[PDB]
Amino acid sequence: GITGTWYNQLGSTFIVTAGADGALTGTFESAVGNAESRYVLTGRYDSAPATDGSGTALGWTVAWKNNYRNAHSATTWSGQYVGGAEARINTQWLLTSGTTEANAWKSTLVGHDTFTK
Amino acid sequence: GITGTWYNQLGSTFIVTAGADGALTGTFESAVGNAESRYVLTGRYDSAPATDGSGTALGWTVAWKNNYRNAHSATTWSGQYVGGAEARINTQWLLTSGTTEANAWKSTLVGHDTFTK
Amino acid sequence: GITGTWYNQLGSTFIVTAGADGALTGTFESAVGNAESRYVLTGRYDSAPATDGSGTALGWTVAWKNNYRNAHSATTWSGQYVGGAEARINTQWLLTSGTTEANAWKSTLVGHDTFTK
Amino acid sequence: GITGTWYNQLGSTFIVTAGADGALTGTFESAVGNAESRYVLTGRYDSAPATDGSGTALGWTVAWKNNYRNAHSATTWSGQYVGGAEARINTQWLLTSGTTEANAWKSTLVGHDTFTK
Numbered sequence: 001g002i003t004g005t006w007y008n009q010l011g012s013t014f015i016v017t018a019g020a021d022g023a024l025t026g027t028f029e030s031a032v033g034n035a036e037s038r039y040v041l042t043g044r045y046d047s048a049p050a051t052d053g054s055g056t057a058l059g060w061t062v063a064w065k066n067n068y069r070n071a072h073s074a075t076t077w078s079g080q081y082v083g084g085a086e087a088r089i090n091t092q093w094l095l096t097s098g099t100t101e102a103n104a105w106k107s108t109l110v111g112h113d114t115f116t117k
Numbered sequence: 118g119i120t121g122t123w124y125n126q127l128g129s130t131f132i133v134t135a136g137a138d139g140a141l142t143g144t145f146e147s148a149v150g151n152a153e154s155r156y157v158l159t160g161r162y163d164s165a166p167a168t169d170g171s172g173t174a175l176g177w178t179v180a181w182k183n184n185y186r187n188a189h190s191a192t193t194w195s196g197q198y199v200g201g202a203e204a205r206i207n208t209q210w211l212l213t214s215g216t217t218e219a220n221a222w223k224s225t226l227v228g229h230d231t232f233t234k
Numbered sequence: 235g236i237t238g239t240w241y242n243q244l245g246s247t248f249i250v251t252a253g254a255d256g257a258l259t260g261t262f263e264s265a266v267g268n269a270e271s272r273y274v275l276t277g278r279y280d281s282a283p284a285t286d287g288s289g290t291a292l293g294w295t296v297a298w299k300n301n302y303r304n305a306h307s308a309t310t311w312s313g314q315y316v317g318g319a320e321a322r323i324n325t326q327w328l329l330t331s332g333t334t335e336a337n338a339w340k341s342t343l344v345g346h347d348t349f350t351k
Numbered sequence: 352g353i354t355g356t357w358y359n360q361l362g363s364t365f366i367v368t369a370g371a372d373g374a375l376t377g378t379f380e381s382a383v384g385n386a387e388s389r390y391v392l393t394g395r396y397d398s399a400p401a402t403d404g405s406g407t408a409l410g411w412t413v414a415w416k417n418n419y420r421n422a423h424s425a426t427t428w429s430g431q432y433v434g435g436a437e438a439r440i441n442t443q444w445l446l447t448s449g450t451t452e453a454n455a456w457k458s459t460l461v462g463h464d465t466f467t468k
């Protein structure tokens with residue numbers, strides 16, 4: 001259910017593979033930020049989710065460095081995959097920039113991303 | 118650097134390998150919550166950090182399933198590594214549990230972990 | 235334009251008054267969790283927002299104690315009012331529960347609520 | 352145990368009164384950011400906490416507008432008060448700044464502040 005191409009509401013594109021070993025691999029292309037072109041992502045997901053019918057927990061990270069640019073920052077998405085005819089991957093994320101210790105207080109942005117097929 | 122065995126304020130053990138490609142790989146062992154023994158982890162980090170004094174942005178994910186147990190959940194840690202004198206990794210984290218859609222408002226915990234050696 | 239009766243995506247009811255000094259006062263009624271009927275809320279908003287299309291920052295707090303129940307918890311919403319046809323209030327919130335110190339790591343839930351009238 | 356003067360790790364000064372009804376009122380002075388002098392705060396706390404050694408849930412909001420300047424932004428702190436010889440208020444916070452809708456994705460900073468007497 002997770003393997004595939006996914007899109008968030010910012011227009012970003014999440015390309016991923018969910019391996020049988022609980023691993024997540026692919027690329028992310030931000031529609032915003034100090035970004036351009038695809039960035040490597042990787043993460044993990046629950047390969048044996050609950051019987052009851054709850055979403056499948058997962059999470060992944062992108063460090064915003066690629067051959068084209070480096071924003072000295074990383075985002076992690078934490079959320080759950082939700083099957084349906086309207087499958088969704090519902091996330092909250094944390095984006096931390098490298099800062100001096102003085103500015104550490106403002107190092108991290110927080111947001112929410114909803115991904116659709 | 119970032120490669121090594123680290124411990125957070127809770128006494129959790131974070132065993133990690135920072136690859137020249139920007140990969141993070143190791144194991145996480147949780148002192149608390151619905152967990153036992155080590156869990157696979159994967160993440161990303163800025164392989165070419167700023168030099169002026171900024172920390173090195175990083176992130177990683179744990180899906181809380183292994184050979185012994187499954188919490189049907191996953192945490193992502195987002196933070197910056199601060200090295201030199203007493204190296205530190207300062208993070209913020211999101212722990213998302215699979216849930217029913219009606220319980221989704223209460224799927225995600227938020228916190229902060231600080232790690233040293 | 236903040237003064238009014240708002241509903242979030244969960245169906246909870248936010249009845250607010252934005253005073254001329256920057257105060258938010260009213261009641262919150264949650265459709266979910268360990269709550270029933272109305273709770274006092276209080277908070278602040280930017281009385282002089284910029285005039286560049288930027289939204290209006292605000293925040294409020296509810297302690298989940300009232301004459302019928304006490305969950306021994308508090309939520310705070312931080313966000314901005316967005317004017318227009320579809321006037322909206324977009325927030326992120328933090329729900330802290332009184333825990334012991336050993337359980338504090340899991341004291342705080344995080345989410346995001348969008349309100350309309 | 353909450354009424355009085357408290358200090359966070361960043362130097363800021365939180366002067367607060369916890370009223371009998373669960374009211375938090377007072378004033379915040381920030382050592383950091385787009386702030387000068389003191390700002391009004393208001394919030395709520397659990398005035399009937401548990402007796403099982405659990406902490407006391409509370410939160411407050413600051414809108415960063417006062418007589419001297421306006422950052423067009425607001426912070427909410429959500430946390431719990433822990434008394435004893437080593438009394439503290441442990442919080443996590445969300446700082447939302449007014450922004451256009453296109454920049455809403457980067458509107459909110461998240462962090463944590465520990466307050467001491």
Ligand SMILES: O=C(O)CCCC[C@@H]1SC[C@@H]2NC(=O)N[C@@H]21
Nearest residue numbers: 012030032033034035071073075
């Ligand atoms: O550091 C930067 O500015 C680039 C980060 C990428 C932009 C963020 S990550 C969270 C959110 N979801 C997206 O698709 N884009 C933004």
Ligand SMILES: O=C(O)CCCC[C@@H]1SC[C@@H]2NC(=O)N[C@@H]21
Nearest residue numbers: 129147150151152181188190192
């Ligand atoms: O409880 C679960 O869902 C699985 C165990 C999670 C433990 C969390 S992850 C964030 C925090 N840091 C730790 O070392 N442990 C907790």
Ligand SMILES: O=C(O)CCCC[C@@H]1SC[C@@H]2NC(=O)N[C@@H]21
Nearest residue numbers: 246264267268269298305307309
């Ligand atoms: O469960 C509790 O401890 C008290 C009820 C809190 C309900 C939460 S507050 C954030 C979210 N938005 C709502 O309208 N309800 C939930």
Ligand SMILES: O=C(O)CCCC[C@@H]1SC[C@@H]2NC(=O)N[C@@H]21
Nearest residue numbers: 363383384385386415422424426
């Ligand atoms: O930057 C602004 O818009 C005004 C100053 C904000 C101060 C922030 S609120 C979170 C953090 N904790 C503090 O004590 N100060 C900063």
